[PDB]
Amino acid sequence: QELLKDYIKRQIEYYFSVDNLERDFFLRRKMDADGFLPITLIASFHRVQALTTDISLIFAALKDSKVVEIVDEKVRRREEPEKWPLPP
RNA sequence: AAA
């Protein structure tokens, strides 16, 4: 699963890139006030779900990331996460 | 719905 982990990691790092966040109103509207999103919501996004439905593999791919931070079931951008949330 |  190592290569699949790499593809999943780079995909989710794109969702949490500044490039994407400046236009990703859906994702920001789903953030809580600290920037956190359920990892299972990210798991449902088409390009991730195509790669895997294995939630342990998604968690392991994100543990590998410098871009995001995981707390329990939730994930957010590590850098300035509070700047991105939007009203639902 | 590179939600």
Curated annotation (Swiss-Prot):
<comment type="subunit">
    <text>Interacts with PABPC1/PABP. Interacts with EIF4A1. Interacts with RPTOR. Recruited to the active mTORC1 complex via interaction with RPTOR. Inhibition of mTORC1 activity strongly reduces interaction with RPTOR and the mTORC1 complex. Identified in a complex with mRNA, PABPC1, EIF4E and EIF4G1. Found in a complex with PABPC1 and SHFL.</text>
</comment>
<protein>
    <recommendedName>
        <fullName>La-related protein 1</fullName>
    </recommendedName>
</protein>
<comment type="function">
    <text>(Microbial infection) Positively regulates the replication of dengue virus (DENV).</text>
</comment>
<comment type="similarity">
    <text>Belongs to the LARP family.</text>
</comment>
<comment type="function">
    <text>RNA-binding protein that regulates the translation of specific target mRNA species downstream of the mTORC1 complex, in function of growth signals and nutrient availability. Interacts on the one hand with the 3' poly-A tails that are present in all mRNA molecules, and on the other hand with the 7-methylguanosine cap structure of mRNAs containing a 5' terminal oligopyrimidine (5'TOP) motif, which is present in mRNAs encoding ribosomal proteins and several components of the translation machinery.</text>
</comment>
<feature type="domain" description="HTH La-type RNA-binding">
    <location>
        <begin position="1"/>
        <end position="88"/>
    </location>
</feature>
